[PDB]
Amino acid sequence: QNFITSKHNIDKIMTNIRLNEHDNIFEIGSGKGHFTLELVQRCNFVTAIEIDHKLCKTTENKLVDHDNFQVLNKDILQFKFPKNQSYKIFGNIPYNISTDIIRKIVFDSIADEIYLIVEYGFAKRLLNTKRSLALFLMAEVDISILSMVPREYFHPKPKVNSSLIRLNRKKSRISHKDKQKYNYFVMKWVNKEYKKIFTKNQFNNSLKHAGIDDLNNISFEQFLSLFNSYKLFNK
């Protein structure tokens, strides 16, 4: 399924993407040379990553008269992203893409932007409140559907589709300062344990101030309001 190769699609989806030849990026998955090639000439440098040795050789060649190399073959989860130079990230790892890779990628790198095709269903998984994962990512990165990946641009596996997503950061809050506090909150909130967050004197105006009715459908923004109220309550 490690497909999706065919320069015409790999040009049509790169279409809406904002990489250029000033960007150094990380190829989270390798695939089968397909993408690590379209980018090597599109961005400055590239550093792919896929563990099994075979694949790297595959890539290794599909990239000649092209020296923007680096096709390391280690466990991404274990990978140490740079914490100095600025860069982006791309990964055609739908099917193989977990949440642990999405975390490495988002909370453990200073990657400015993260583009990645993911099963469309995995998108909401990241796009819905009352789902910590989302409430956590949304505090720094901005998740958005950029494109879709209809037909079998890959091979089979439908039941569903893939879809291109962009994760772009903002300096934004949720100050490391109060970040253990934001996690509790996120934790307790999604766990419906509002009894640990604020008191009922609070669970109310808080909701009323965030202008929250469908409490079962928050808007992060509202969750934001909440955390803030919470943050400034003391009983």
Side-chain angles (χ1 to χ4, degrees), residues 74-115:
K74 190 155 289 175
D75 183 47
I76 196 68
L77 306 200
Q78 303 295 302
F79 181 55
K80 303 167 193 176
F81 285 88
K83 261 50 185 315
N84 26 296
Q85 65 198 67
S86 63
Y87 55 91
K88 295 192 174 296
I89 281 189
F90 190 86
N92 194 305
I93 179 188
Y95 316 132
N96 189 292
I97 186 67
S98 60
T99 58
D100 283 357
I101 6 185
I102 277 296
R103 290 172 163 64
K104 184 62 173 172
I105 295 321
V106 185
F107 305 117
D108 208 46
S109 69
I110 73 197
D112 303 58
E113 277 197 346
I114 290 165
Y115 294 86

mmCIF file of all heavy atoms in Angstrom, residues 74-115:
data_model
loop_
_atom_site.group_PDB
_atom_site.id
_atom_site.type_symbol
_atom_site.label_atom_id
_atom_site.label_comp_id
_atom_site.label_asym_id
_atom_site.label_seq_id
_atom_site.Cartn_x
_atom_site.Cartn_y
_atom_site.Cartn_z
ATOM 1 N N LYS A 74 15.863 5.000 10.888
ATOM 2 C CA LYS A 74 15.564 4.662 12.267
ATOM 3 C C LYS A 74 14.089 4.848 12.640
ATOM 4 O O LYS A 74 13.248 5.213 11.803
ATOM 5 C CB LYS A 74 16.492 5.426 13.229
ATOM 6 C CG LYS A 74 16.411 4.964 14.704
ATOM 7 C CD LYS A 74 17.694 5.259 15.510
ATOM 8 C CE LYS A 74 18.875 4.350 15.086
ATOM 9 N NZ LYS A 74 20.184 4.667 15.751
ATOM 10 N N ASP A 75 13.785 4.526 13.896
ATOM 11 C CA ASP A 75 12.443 4.619 14.440
ATOM 12 C C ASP A 75 12.195 6.094 14.689
ATOM 13 O O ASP A 75 12.887 6.715 15.498
ATOM 14 C CB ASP A 75 12.378 3.809 15.740
ATOM 15 C CG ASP A 75 10.995 3.789 16.356
ATOM 16 O OD1 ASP A 75 10.021 3.542 15.619
ATOM 17 O OD2 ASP A 75 10.878 3.997 17.583
ATOM 18 N N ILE A 76 11.225 6.659 13.972
ATOM 19 C CA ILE A 76 10.908 8.080 14.109
ATOM 20 C C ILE A 76 10.649 8.442 15.567
ATOM 21 O O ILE A 76 11.198 9.424 16.080
ATOM 22 C CB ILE A 76 9.662 8.467 13.286
ATOM 23 C CG1 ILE A 76 9.592 9.988 13.118
ATOM 24 C CG2 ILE A 76 8.395 8.002 13.994
ATOM 25 C CD1 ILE A 76 10.689 10.594 12.245
ATOM 26 N N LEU A 77 9.831 7.630 16.231
ATOM 27 C CA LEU A 77 9.486 7.866 17.614
ATOM 28 C C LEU A 77 10.745 8.155 18.412
ATOM 29 O O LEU A 77 10.753 9.028 19.278
ATOM 30 C CB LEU A 77 8.752 6.657 18.183
ATOM 31 C CG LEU A 77 7.513 6.129 17.450
ATOM 32 C CD1 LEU A 77 6.713 5.303 18.413
ATOM 33 C CD2 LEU A 77 6.633 7.242 16.972
ATOM 34 N N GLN A 78 11.810 7.429 18.090
ATOM 35 C CA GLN A 78 13.104 7.565 18.745
ATOM 36 C C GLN A 78 14.000 8.678 18.125
ATOM 37 O O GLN A 78 15.009 9.103 18.716
ATOM 38 C CB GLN A 78 13.816 6.230 18.667
ATOM 39 C CG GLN A 78 13.037 5.135 19.263
ATOM 40 C CD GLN A 78 12.855 5.335 20.738
ATOM 41 O OE1 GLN A 78 13.831 5.434 21.490
ATOM 42 N NE2 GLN A 78 11.603 5.395 21.174
ATOM 43 N N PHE A 79 13.616 9.158 16.946
ATOM 44 C CA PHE A 79 14.367 10.183 16.243
ATOM 45 C C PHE A 79 14.519 11.491 17.006
ATOM 46 O O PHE A 79 13.569 11.926 17.621
ATOM 47 C CB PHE A 79 13.680 10.463 14.910
ATOM 48 C CG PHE A 79 14.389 11.488 14.094
ATOM 49 C CD1 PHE A 79 15.737 11.316 13.775
ATOM 50 C CD2 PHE A 79 13.764 12.670 13.750
ATOM 51 C CE1 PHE A 79 16.441 12.301 13.155
ATOM 52 C CE2 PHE A 79 14.477 13.670 13.116
ATOM 53 C CZ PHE A 79 15.816 13.487 12.825
ATOM 54 N N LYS A 80 15.691 12.126 16.975
ATOM 55 C CA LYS A 80 15.870 13.421 17.670
ATOM 56 C C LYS A 80 15.799 14.578 16.692
ATOM 57 O O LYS A 80 16.811 14.917 16.073
ATOM 58 C CB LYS A 80 17.213 13.492 18.411
ATOM 59 C CG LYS A 80 17.436 12.395 19.437
ATOM 60 C CD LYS A 80 18.903 12.349 19.884
ATOM 61 C CE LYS A 80 19.237 11.076 20.671
ATOM 62 N NZ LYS A 80 20.683 10.987 21.034
ATOM 63 N N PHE A 81 14.620 15.177 16.525
ATOM 64 C CA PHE A 81 14.502 16.320 15.615
ATOM 65 C C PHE A 81 15.343 17.498 16.064
ATOM 66 O O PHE A 81 15.611 17.713 17.246
ATOM 67 C CB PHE A 81 13.066 16.790 15.531
ATOM 68 C CG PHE A 81 12.187 15.903 14.715
ATOM 69 C CD1 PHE A 81 11.537 14.815 15.297
ATOM 70 C CD2 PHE A 81 12.037 16.130 13.343
ATOM 71 C CE1 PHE A 81 10.758 13.961 14.529
ATOM 72 C CE2 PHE A 81 11.256 15.286 12.559
ATOM 73 C CZ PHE A 81 10.614 14.191 13.152
ATOM 74 N N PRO A 82 15.817 18.274 15.121
ATOM 75 C CA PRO A 82 16.620 19.428 15.530
ATOM 76 C C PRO A 82 15.840 20.445 16.389
ATOM 77 O O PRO A 82 14.627 20.617 16.232
ATOM 78 C CB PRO A 82 17.075 19.996 14.190
ATOM 79 C CG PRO A 82 15.968 19.596 13.285
ATOM 80 C CD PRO A 82 15.761 18.162 13.667
ATOM 81 N N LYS A 83 16.543 21.101 17.311
ATOM 82 C CA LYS A 83 15.947 22.123 18.194
ATOM 83 C C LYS A 83 16.629 23.466 17.999
ATOM 84 O O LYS A 83 16.604 24.325 18.885
ATOM 85 C CB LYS A 83 16.071 21.713 19.663
ATOM 86 C CG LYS A 83 14.821 21.113 20.202
ATOM 87 C CD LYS A 83 14.292 20.029 19.307
ATOM 88 C CE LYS A 83 12.981 19.550 19.838
ATOM 89 N NZ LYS A 83 13.118 19.379 21.318
ATOM 90 N N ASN A 84 17.250 23.609 16.830
ATOM 91 C CA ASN A 84 17.974 24.813 16.420
ATOM 92 C C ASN A 84 17.437 25.386 15.098
ATOM 93 O O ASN A 84 16.566 26.269 15.103
ATOM 94 C CB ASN A 84 19.474 24.500 16.302
ATOM 95 C CG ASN A 84 19.735 23.035 16.008
ATOM 96 O OD1 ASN A 84 19.419 22.163 16.835
ATOM 97 N ND2 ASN A 84 20.299 22.750 14.830
ATOM 98 N N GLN A 85 17.960 24.883 13.982
ATOM 99 C CA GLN A 85 17.547 25.308 12.649
ATOM 100 C C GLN A 85 16.025 25.149 12.482
ATOM 101 O O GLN A 85 15.393 24.348 13.174
ATOM 102 C CB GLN A 85 18.269 24.445 11.631
ATOM 103 C CG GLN A 85 17.857 23.001 11.725
ATOM 104 C CD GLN A 85 18.824 22.060 11.053
ATOM 105 O OE1 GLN A 85 19.956 21.915 11.500
ATOM 106 N NE2 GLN A 85 18.382 21.403 9.981
ATOM 107 N N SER A 86 15.448 25.899 11.547
ATOM 108 C CA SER A 86 14.011 25.857 11.283
ATOM 109 C C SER A 86 13.730 24.938 10.126
ATOM 110 O O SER A 86 14.506 24.881 9.184
ATOM 111 C CB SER A 86 13.495 27.249 10.926
ATOM 112 O OG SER A 86 14.091 27.735 9.730
ATOM 113 N N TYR A 87 12.588 24.261 10.162
ATOM 114 C CA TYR A 87 12.261 23.329 9.091
ATOM 115 C C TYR A 87 10.802 22.854 9.038
ATOM 116 O O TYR A 87 9.991 23.180 9.894
ATOM 117 C CB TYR A 87 13.190 22.150 9.243
ATOM 118 C CG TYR A 87 13.100 21.572 10.607
ATOM 119 C CD1 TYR A 87 12.203 20.560 10.887
ATOM 120 C CD2 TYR A 87 13.876 22.087 11.645
ATOM 121 C CE1 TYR A 87 12.081 20.053 12.190
ATOM 122 C CE2 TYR A 87 13.768 21.597 12.948
ATOM 123 C CZ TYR A 87 12.871 20.573 13.210
ATOM 124 O OH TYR A 87 12.826 20.023 14.467
ATOM 125 N N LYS A 88 10.469 22.076 8.021
ATOM 126 C CA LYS A 88 9.126 21.606 7.901
ATOM 127 C C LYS A 88 9.090 20.090 7.985
ATOM 128 O O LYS A 88 10.097 19.483 8.349
ATOM 129 C CB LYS A 88 8.526 22.133 6.611
ATOM 130 C CG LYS A 88 8.393 23.665 6.639
ATOM 131 C CD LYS A 88 7.538 24.207 5.487
ATOM 132 C CE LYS A 88 7.296 25.699 5.610
ATOM 133 N NZ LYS A 88 6.488 26.104 6.824
ATOM 134 N N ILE A 89 7.933 19.494 7.690
ATOM 135 C CA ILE A 89 7.764 18.048 7.771
ATOM 136 C C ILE A 89 6.635 17.558 6.854
ATOM 137 O O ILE A 89 5.578 18.193 6.763
ATOM 138 C CB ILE A 89 7.448 17.542 9.227
ATOM 139 C CG1 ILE A 89 8.732 17.471 10.046
ATOM 140 C CG2 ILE A 89 6.746 16.159 9.203
ATOM 141 C CD1 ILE A 89 8.569 16.793 11.375
ATOM 142 N N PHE A 90 6.881 16.412 6.207
ATOM 143 C CA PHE A 90 5.966 15.785 5.273
ATOM 144 C C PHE A 90 5.956 14.277 5.534
ATOM 145 O O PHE A 90 6.998 13.682 5.791
ATOM 146 C CB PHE A 90 6.440 16.036 3.843
ATOM 147 C CG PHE A 90 5.442 15.626 2.801
ATOM 148 C CD1 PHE A 90 4.432 16.498 2.407
ATOM 149 C CD2 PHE A 90 5.447 14.329 2.291
ATOM 150 C CE1 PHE A 90 3.436 16.088 1.530
ATOM 151 C CE2 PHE A 90 4.454 13.908 1.414
ATOM 152 C CZ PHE A 90 3.443 14.795 1.035
ATOM 153 N N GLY A 91 4.785 13.649 5.454
ATOM 154 C CA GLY A 91 4.710 12.214 5.693
ATOM 155 C C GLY A 91 3.529 11.522 5.015
ATOM 156 O O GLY A 91 2.363 11.801 5.312
ATOM 157 N N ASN A 92 3.835 10.619 4.083
ATOM 158 C CA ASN A 92 2.788 9.874 3.368
ATOM 159 C C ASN A 92 2.763 8.553 4.053
ATOM 160 O O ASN A 92 3.055 7.507 3.477
ATOM 161 C CB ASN A 92 3.143 9.706 1.877
ATOM 162 C CG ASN A 92 1.948 9.255 1.039
ATOM 163 O OD1 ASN A 92 1.307 8.237 1.318
ATOM 164 N ND2 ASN A 92 1.647 10.019 -0.005
ATOM 165 N N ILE A 93 2.406 8.628 5.314
ATOM 166 C CA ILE A 93 2.349 7.466 6.127
ATOM 167 C C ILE A 93 0.902 7.114 6.440
ATOM 168 O O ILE A 93 0.654 6.463 7.444
ATOM 169 C CB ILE A 93 3.154 7.747 7.417
ATOM 170 C CG1 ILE A 93 3.135 6.556 8.365
ATOM 171 C CG2 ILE A 93 2.585 8.972 8.105
ATOM 172 C CD1 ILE A 93 3.753 6.885 9.702
ATOM 173 N N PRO A 94 -0.083 7.503 5.582
ATOM 174 C CA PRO A 94 -1.433 7.093 6.022
ATOM 175 C C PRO A 94 -1.364 5.584 6.135
ATOM 176 O O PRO A 94 -0.624 4.957 5.363
ATOM 177 C CB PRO A 94 -2.342 7.596 4.885
ATOM 178 C CG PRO A 94 -1.430 7.551 3.676
ATOM 179 C CD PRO A 94 -0.168 8.184 4.272
ATOM 180 N N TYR A 95 -2.099 4.978 7.060
ATOM 181 C CA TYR A 95 -1.977 3.525 7.208
ATOM 182 C C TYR A 95 -0.530 3.449 7.700
ATOM 183 O O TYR A 95 0.394 3.517 6.888
ATOM 184 C CB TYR A 95 -2.047 2.782 5.849
ATOM 185 C CG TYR A 95 -3.118 3.259 4.886
ATOM 186 C CD1 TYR A 95 -2.818 3.521 3.546
ATOM 187 C CD2 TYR A 95 -4.407 3.513 5.326
ATOM 188 C CE1 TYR A 95 -3.781 4.042 2.685
ATOM 189 C CE2 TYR A 95 -5.371 4.030 4.473
ATOM 190 C CZ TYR A 95 -5.055 4.301 3.163
ATOM 191 O OH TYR A 95 -6.019 4.900 2.383
ATOM 192 N N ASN A 96 -0.332 3.341 9.007
ATOM 193 C CA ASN A 96 1.013 3.282 9.587
ATOM 194 C C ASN A 96 1.154 4.473 10.521
ATOM 195 O O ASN A 96 1.946 4.447 11.471
ATOM 196 C CB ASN A 96 2.090 3.366 8.494
ATOM 197 C CG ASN A 96 3.484 3.098 9.016
ATOM 198 O OD1 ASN A 96 4.050 3.889 9.791
ATOM 199 N ND2 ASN A 96 4.053 1.960 8.602
ATOM 200 N N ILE A 97 0.363 5.508 10.231
ATOM 201 C CA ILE A 97 0.344 6.748 10.998
ATOM 202 C C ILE A 97 -0.446 6.481 12.278
ATOM 203 O O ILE A 97 -1.589 6.032 12.242
ATOM 204 C CB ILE A 97 -0.299 7.931 10.160
ATOM 205 C CG1 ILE A 97 -0.185 9.278 10.890
ATOM 206 C CG2 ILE A 97 -1.743 7.635 9.864
ATOM 207 C CD1 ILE A 97 1.243 9.790 11.041
ATOM 208 N N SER A 98 0.196 6.719 13.413
ATOM 209 C CA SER A 98 -0.433 6.529 14.701
ATOM 210 C C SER A 98 -0.606 7.886 15.345
ATOM 211 O O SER A 98 -0.563 8.929 14.683
ATOM 212 C CB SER A 98 0.433 5.649 15.608
ATOM 213 O OG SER A 98 1.712 6.211 15.860
ATOM 214 N N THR A 99 -0.802 7.863 16.652
ATOM 215 C CA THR A 99 -0.948 9.085 17.400
ATOM 216 C C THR A 99 0.422 9.340 17.995
ATOM 217 O O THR A 99 0.829 10.480 18.214
ATOM 218 C CB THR A 99 -2.000 8.913 18.476
ATOM 219 O OG1 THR A 99 -1.631 7.835 19.340
ATOM 220 C CG2 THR A 99 -3.314 8.578 17.836
ATOM 221 N N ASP A 100 1.161 8.262 18.228
ATOM 222 C CA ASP A 100 2.495 8.417 18.791
ATOM 223 C C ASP A 100 3.433 9.080 17.799
ATOM 224 O O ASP A 100 4.390 9.748 18.194
ATOM 225 C CB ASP A 100 3.049 7.076 19.260
ATOM 226 C CG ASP A 100 2.434 6.633 20.582
ATOM 227 O OD1 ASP A 100 1.613 7.398 21.164
ATOM 228 O OD2 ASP A 100 2.782 5.522 21.047
ATOM 229 N N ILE A 101 3.160 8.910 16.508
ATOM 230 C CA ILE A 101 4.001 9.557 15.513
ATOM 231 C C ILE A 101 3.551 10.979 15.398
ATOM 232 O O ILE A 101 4.368 11.854 15.164
ATOM 233 C CB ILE A 101 3.908 8.940 14.095
ATOM 234 C CG1 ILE A 101 2.841 7.865 14.038
ATOM 235 C CG2 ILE A 101 5.236 8.324 13.703
ATOM 236 C CD1 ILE A 101 2.821 7.166 12.719
ATOM 237 N N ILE A 102 2.247 11.208 15.548
ATOM 238 C CA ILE A 102 1.683 12.565 15.477
ATOM 239 C C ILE A 102 2.161 13.420 16.658
ATOM 240 O O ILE A 102 2.197 14.646 16.572
ATOM 241 C CB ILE A 102 0.135 12.531 15.484
ATOM 242 C CG1 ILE A 102 -0.384 12.272 14.083
ATOM 243 C CG2 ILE A 102 -0.430 13.809 16.081
ATOM 244 C CD1 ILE A 102 -0.053 13.346 13.116
ATOM 245 N N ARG A 103 2.528 12.769 17.760
ATOM 246 C CA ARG A 103 2.990 13.486 18.932
ATOM 247 C C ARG A 103 4.461 13.872 18.769
ATOM 248 O O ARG A 103 4.851 15.037 18.950
ATOM 249 C CB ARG A 103 2.787 12.608 20.171
ATOM 250 C CG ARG A 103 1.315 12.393 20.595
ATOM 251 C CD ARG A 103 1.221 11.355 21.713
ATOM 252 N NE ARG A 103 -0.052 11.372 22.427
ATOM 253 C CZ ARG A 103 -1.243 11.091 21.901
ATOM 254 N NH1 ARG A 103 -1.356 10.754 20.622
ATOM 255 N NH2 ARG A 103 -2.327 11.137 22.672
ATOM 256 N N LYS A 104 5.275 12.873 18.444
ATOM 257 C CA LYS A 104 6.700 13.073 18.206
ATOM 258 C C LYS A 104 6.726 14.356 17.381
ATOM 259 O O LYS A 104 7.108 15.420 17.846
ATOM 260 C CB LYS A 104 7.224 11.898 17.379
ATOM 261 C CG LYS A 104 8.704 11.903 17.134
ATOM 262 C CD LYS A 104 9.478 11.822 18.431
ATOM 263 C CE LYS A 104 10.957 11.660 18.168
ATOM 264 N NZ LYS A 104 11.784 11.766 19.415
ATOM 265 N N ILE A 105 6.243 14.205 16.159
ATOM 266 C CA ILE A 105 6.091 15.222 15.148
ATOM 267 C C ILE A 105 5.646 16.601 15.675
ATOM 268 O O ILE A 105 6.304 17.608 15.395
ATOM 269 C CB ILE A 105 5.113 14.597 14.050
ATOM 270 C CG1 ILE A 105 5.837 13.420 13.416
ATOM 271 C CG2 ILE A 105 4.666 15.556 12.961
ATOM 272 C CD1 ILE A 105 7.317 13.671 13.199
ATOM 273 N N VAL A 106 4.570 16.660 16.460
ATOM 274 C CA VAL A 106 4.057 17.958 16.961
ATOM 275 C C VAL A 106 4.613 18.483 18.291
ATOM 276 O O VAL A 106 4.956 19.662 18.395
ATOM 277 C CB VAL A 106 2.499 17.958 17.116
ATOM 278 C CG1 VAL A 106 2.029 19.316 17.496
ATOM 279 C CG2 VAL A 106 1.835 17.544 15.847
ATOM 280 N N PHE A 107 4.689 17.638 19.313
ATOM 281 C CA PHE A 107 5.167 18.145 20.582
ATOM 282 C C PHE A 107 6.645 17.950 20.746
ATOM 283 O O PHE A 107 7.249 18.553 21.622
ATOM 284 C CB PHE A 107 4.396 17.518 21.772
ATOM 285 C CG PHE A 107 2.909 17.683 21.680
ATOM 286 C CD1 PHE A 107 2.075 16.559 21.583
ATOM 287 C CD2 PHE A 107 2.336 18.967 21.611
ATOM 288 C CE1 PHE A 107 0.681 16.710 21.415
ATOM 289 C CE2 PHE A 107 0.941 19.142 21.441
ATOM 290 C CZ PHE A 107 0.111 18.011 21.343
ATOM 291 N N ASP A 108 7.266 17.137 19.900
ATOM 292 C CA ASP A 108 8.701 16.969 20.076
ATOM 293 C C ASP A 108 9.657 17.476 18.968
ATOM 294 O O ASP A 108 10.779 17.000 18.829
ATOM 295 C CB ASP A 108 9.007 15.530 20.459
ATOM 296 C CG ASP A 108 10.255 15.444 21.260
ATOM 297 O OD1 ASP A 108 10.367 16.286 22.179
ATOM 298 O OD2 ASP A 108 11.109 14.573 20.984
ATOM 299 N N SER A 109 9.203 18.448 18.187
ATOM 300 C CA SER A 109 10.032 19.076 17.166
ATOM 301 C C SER A 109 9.549 20.514 17.089
ATOM 302 O O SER A 109 8.462 20.841 17.587
ATOM 303 C CB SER A 109 9.874 18.421 15.793
ATOM 304 O OG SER A 109 8.610 18.645 15.207
ATOM 305 N N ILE A 110 10.361 21.379 16.491
ATOM 306 C CA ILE A 110 9.997 22.778 16.349
ATOM 307 C C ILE A 110 9.675 22.989 14.888
ATOM 308 O O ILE A 110 9.807 24.082 14.357
ATOM 309 C CB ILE A 110 11.122 23.696 16.763
ATOM 310 C CG1 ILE A 110 12.239 23.685 15.745
ATOM 311 C CG2 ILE A 110 11.689 23.246 18.098
ATOM 312 C CD1 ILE A 110 13.541 24.265 16.314
ATOM 313 N N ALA A 111 9.302 21.891 14.239
ATOM 314 C CA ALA A 111 8.900 21.917 12.854
ATOM 315 C C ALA A 111 7.874 23.046 12.770
ATOM 316 O O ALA A 111 6.937 23.092 13.553
ATOM 317 C CB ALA A 111 8.261 20.580 12.479
ATOM 318 N N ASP A 112 8.075 23.969 11.838
ATOM 319 C CA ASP A 112 7.176 25.107 11.663
ATOM 320 C C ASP A 112 5.854 24.626 11.089
ATOM 321 O O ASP A 112 4.795 25.033 11.533
ATOM 322 C CB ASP A 112 7.784 26.137 10.696
ATOM 323 C CG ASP A 112 9.151 26.650 11.143
ATOM 324 O OD1 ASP A 112 10.088 25.830 11.328
ATOM 325 O OD2 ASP A 112 9.285 27.887 11.296
ATOM 326 N N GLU A 113 5.925 23.771 10.081
ATOM 327 C CA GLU A 113 4.730 23.269 9.451
ATOM 328 C C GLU A 113 4.821 21.789 9.221
ATOM 329 O O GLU A 113 5.881 21.273 8.896
ATOM 330 C CB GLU A 113 4.491 23.945 8.113
ATOM 331 C CG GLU A 113 3.802 25.283 8.165
ATOM 332 C CD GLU A 113 3.242 25.654 6.795
ATOM 333 O OE1 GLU A 113 3.634 24.997 5.801
ATOM 334 O OE2 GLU A 113 2.414 26.592 6.706
ATOM 335 N N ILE A 114 3.689 21.113 9.370
ATOM 336 C CA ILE A 114 3.617 19.674 9.191
ATOM 337 C C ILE A 114 2.514 19.286 8.233
ATOM 338 O O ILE A 114 1.324 19.424 8.542
ATOM 339 C CB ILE A 114 3.347 18.965 10.510
ATOM 340 C CG1 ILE A 114 4.571 19.050 11.408
ATOM 341 C CG2 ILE A 114 2.968 17.562 10.249
ATOM 342 C CD1 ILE A 114 4.273 18.691 12.821
ATOM 343 N N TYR A 115 2.919 18.806 7.063
ATOM 344 C CA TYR A 115 1.971 18.363 6.052
ATOM 345 C C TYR A 115 1.974 16.852 6.081
ATOM 346 O O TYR A 115 3.024 16.231 6.214
ATOM 347 C CB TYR A 115 2.378 18.846 4.658
ATOM 348 C CG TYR A 115 2.313 20.336 4.482
ATOM 349 C CD1 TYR A 115 3.386 21.153 4.841
ATOM 350 C CD2 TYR A 115 1.168 20.935 3.944
ATOM 351 C CE1 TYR A 115 3.323 22.529 4.656
ATOM 352 C CE2 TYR A 115 1.093 22.310 3.757
ATOM 353 C CZ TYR A 115 2.171 23.095 4.107
ATOM 354 O OH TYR A 115 2.099 24.440 3.868
#
